[PDB]
Amino acid sequence: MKTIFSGIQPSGVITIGNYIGALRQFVELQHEYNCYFCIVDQHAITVWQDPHELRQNIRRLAALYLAVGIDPTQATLFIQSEVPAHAQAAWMLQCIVYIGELERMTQFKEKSAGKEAVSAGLLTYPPLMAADILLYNTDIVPVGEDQKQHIELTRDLAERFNKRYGELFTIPEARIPKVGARIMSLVDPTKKMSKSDPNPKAYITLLDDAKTIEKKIKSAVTDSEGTIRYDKEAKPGISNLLNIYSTLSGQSIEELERQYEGKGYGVFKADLAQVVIETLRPIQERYHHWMESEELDRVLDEGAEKANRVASEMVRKMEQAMGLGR
Amino acid sequence: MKTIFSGIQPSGVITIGNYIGALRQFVELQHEYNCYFCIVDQHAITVWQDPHELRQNIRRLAALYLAVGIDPTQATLFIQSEVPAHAQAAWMLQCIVYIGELERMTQFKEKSAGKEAVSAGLLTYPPLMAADILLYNTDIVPVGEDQKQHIELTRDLAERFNKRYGELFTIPEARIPKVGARIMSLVDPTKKMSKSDPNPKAYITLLDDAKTIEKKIKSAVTDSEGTIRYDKEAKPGISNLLNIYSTLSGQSIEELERQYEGKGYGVFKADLAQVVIETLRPIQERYHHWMESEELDRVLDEGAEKANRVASEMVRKMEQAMGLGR
Ligand SMILES: Nc1ncnc2c1ncn2[C@@H]1O[C@H](COP(=O)(O)OC(=O)[C@@H](N)Cc2c[nH]c3ccccc23)[C@@H](O)[C@H]1O
Ligand SMILES: Nc1ncnc2c1ncn2[C@@H]1O[C@H](COP(=O)(O)OC(=O)[C@@H](N)Cc2c[nH]c3ccccc23)[C@@H](O)[C@H]1O
Ligand SMILES: [N+]
Ligand SMILES: [N+]
Numbered sequence: 001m002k003t004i005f006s007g008i009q010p011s012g013v014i015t016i017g018n019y020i021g022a023l024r025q026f027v028e029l030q031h032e033y034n035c036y037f038c039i040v041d042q043h044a045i046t047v048w049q050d051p052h053e054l055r056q057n058i059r060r061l062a063a064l065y066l067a068v069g070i071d072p073t074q075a076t077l078f079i080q081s082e083v084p085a086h087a088q089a090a091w092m093l094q095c096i097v098y099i100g101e102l103e104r105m106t107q108f109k110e111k112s113a114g115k116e117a118v119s120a121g122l123l124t125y126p127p128l129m130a131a132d133i134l135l136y137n138t139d140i141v142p143v144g145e146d147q148k149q150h151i152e153l154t155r156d157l158a159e160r161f162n163k164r165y166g167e168l169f170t171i172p173e174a175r176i177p178k179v180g181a182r183i184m185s186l187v188d189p190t191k192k193m194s195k196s197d198p199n200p201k202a203y204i205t206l207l208d209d210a211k212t213i214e215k216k217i218k219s220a221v222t223d224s225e226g227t228i229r230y231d232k233e234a235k236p237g238i239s240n241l242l243n244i245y246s247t248l249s250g251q252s253i254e255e256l257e258r259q260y261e262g263k264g265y266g267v268f269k270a271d272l273a274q275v276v277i278e279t280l281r282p283i284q285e286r287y288h289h290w291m292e293s294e295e296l297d298r299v300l301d302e303g304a305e306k307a308n309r310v311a312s313e314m315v316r317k318m319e320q321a322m323g324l325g326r
Numbered sequence: 327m328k329t330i331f332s333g334i335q336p337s338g339v340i341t342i343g344n345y346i347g348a349l350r351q352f353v354e355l356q357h358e359y360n361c362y363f364c365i366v367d368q369h370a371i372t373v374w375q376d377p378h379e380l381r382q383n384i385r386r387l388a389a390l391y392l393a394v395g396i397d398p399t400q401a402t403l404f405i406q407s408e409v410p411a412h413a414q415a416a417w418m419l420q421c422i423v424y425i426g427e428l429e430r431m432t433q434f435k436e437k438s439a440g441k442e443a444v445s446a447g448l449l450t451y452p453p454l455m456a457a458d459i460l461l462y463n464t465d466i467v468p469v470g471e472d473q474k475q476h477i478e479l480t481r482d483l484a485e486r487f488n489k490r491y492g493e494l495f496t497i498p499e500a501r502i503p504k505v506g507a508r509i510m511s512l513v514d515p516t517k518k519m520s521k522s523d524p525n526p527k528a529y530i531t532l533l534d535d536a537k538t539i540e541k542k543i544k545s546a547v548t549d550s551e552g553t554i555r556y557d558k559e560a561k562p563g564i565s566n567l568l569n570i571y572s573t574l575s576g577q578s579i580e581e582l583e584r585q586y587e588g589k590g591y592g593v594f595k596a597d598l599a600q601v602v603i604e605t606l607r608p609i610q611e612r613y614h615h616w617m618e619s620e621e622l623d624r625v626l627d628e629g630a631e632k633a634n635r636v637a638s639e640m641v642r643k644m645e646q647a648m649g650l651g652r
Contacts, residue, residue: 120449
């Protein structure tokens with residue numbers, strides 16, 4: 001059976017954009033593929049992190065993965081730093097990637113923009129992400145659209161390694177949702193919904209309460225058309241709301257447009273807020289249960305055990321190929 | 327007792343400059359300090375390496391370390407890639423070092439000079455070297471003058487980590503020989519003697535035979551003074567030969583100047599060649615014995631075991647400090 005790998009950085013904010021673009025896919029695909037889902041703590045430290053908050057954010061993200069439905073009998077959930085292979089593999093790949101290649105990454109240009117002394121991990125983020133993927137002989141990497149470039153570099157690195165040292169890596173392919181690959185800010189729908197937006201009304205976190213969801217959806221920027229129809233260019237706000245509605249409800253954009261034919265944005269927003277609440281409430285309840293359980297650690301212990309068995313073997317093969325060691 | 331750490335890259339050429347600046351110190355200090363001497367294979371791959379040659383160069387360097395007198399009961403000799411902690415620690419430090427800092431490294435500017443697509447490991451070499459040193463709670467790092475800058479960055483990184491996350495690292499200090507810290511090319515004594523000089527007459531390898539040593543010392547560029555006196559600026563060639571002679575023979579520069587008072591370069595060179603031969607012959611004999619022995623692997627197995635115990639514990643402390651993991 002084919003293999004899937006995907007990772008999410010532990011942070012103070014996990015959004016419905018993370019859920020729609022990524023987590024929803026993980027749950028969908030977990031029974032049909034061998035799956036490795038990672039909490040990428042080593043990527044998190046590419047920017048300063050308060051240590052106590054990081055430790056908590058790592059547990060919170062593990063709880064959210066399990067709360068949304070990732071099943072430990074179907075998938076391997078683990079913390080990146082707990083599998084030394086990722087750092088070892090990242091080093092080997094950093095040795096074959098070119099500085100120019102890292103400098104062209106949009107993620108790097110955006111995260112380093114207007115910066116004054118950029119910490120090096122920001123620049124060397126990609127090789128570590130490529131290691132994450134390649135270590136598991138990954139076929140498919142389910143992500144939102146914003147990870148496409150990183151996966152393109154990963155494919156380039158795998159091909160480069162294979163040409164130089166012998167065929168070892170499977171060339172992985174991104175799997176990006178048709179609808180909801182790039183959920184936009186509710187405040188400015190021409191911008192992506194981001195975990196780090198300074199305006200909390202831009203995103204909905206997976207832990208937002210009902211009153212908070214309602215406020216955010218209601219305030220969502222729209223237009224002066226009063227017509228619920230998809231049109232990314234002309235109606236970015238309504239289009240983005242339609243994507244959220246479609247993905248969470250399971251109704252097609254066409255179904256929703258018909259349903260709301262002749263209706264205004266008010267009822268549409270009230271109904272969408274309810275769909276978001278209906279989605280997040282059961283997740284939140286399961287999330288608190290995991291946060292209070294010793295089983296959360298057991299699940300992560302088991303995941304690192306499995307991940308370490310597979311990744312450590314791939315690292316041995318990589319070293320053998322480059323002639324490191326003995 | 328204090329701790330020493332030092333590393334050497336496995337390569338096709340190990341010179342008498344490596345011996346005089348570094349290996350001679352290792353043997354001198356091994357009984358008085360806890361010592362970790364490393365074969366830095368992960369640093370070697372910062373540039374392309376033929377895999378079969380690399381594997382061999384790693385064994386050759388282990389044999390040379392043991393041949394020169396490093397004693398496995400006094401020091402821990404091991405291969406960098408065999409201790410995952412170095413890669414893990416390198417990642418954490420890459421996250422706190424600034425890109426500007428890496429770009430100013432002379433080693434980086436020289437190795438990347440006139441280059442067209444510099445591979446990223448060339449740029450990220452320092453954090454891995456800082457990890458090598460800091461992992462062992464190192465006090466002293468014996469090297470030749472060319473490593474001074476890298477050790478200055480390592481001190482800066484250790485201080486930066488300690489300020490941000492809590493005092494964890496000892497701030498290491500370089501130990502550079504008074505005489506022979508920078509042995510120069512025999513072909514152009516204004517340049518350092520380098521393992522990668524395209525002109526094989528520039529260096530003497532630890533495996534050079536007698537006839538070869540004689541040829542190299544005899545051809546060594548001098549001056550038209552016919553006076554054997556130290557003067558780096560005016561007489562770089564003779565000065566460099568005096569350093570080699572002094573270090574290998576144990577005679578002071580003053581003793582040699584007196585001894586050669588009124589003599590010409592011919593006898594001086596003939597006698598120096600003999601001193602180099604007398605030095606390298608016993609090393610070469612022990613080197614072949616190690617190359618043919620299963621004990622070479624046993625020694626490296628034991629060294630990685632010890633290094634892994636110490637380094638892995640420091641990695642745990644580092645992660646705890648930054649809040650990685652659990
Ligand atoms: N507005 C949005 N709309 C739709 N999808 C979105 C939105 N915002 C985020 N995503 C998706 O969420 C996942 C995690 O996001 P991160 O920023 O942690 O995603 C990141 O920071 C990666 N570098 C983490 C990573 C590290 N190693 C990996 C290996 C494979 C895949 C992913 C990774 C991703 O799938 C991301 O595309
Ligand atoms: N002409 C010369 N005269 C005097 N000393 C010289 C001469 N040429 C070389 N050396 C010294 O030899 C040692 C190994 O040299 P490398 O180029 O492998 O040295 C290198 O390439 C380091 N990056 C390896 C390293 C990796 N991690 C470390 C941690 C601590 C100390 C050293 C390391 C060094 O002591 C070097 O100063
Ligand atoms: N599965
Ligand atoms: N010792």
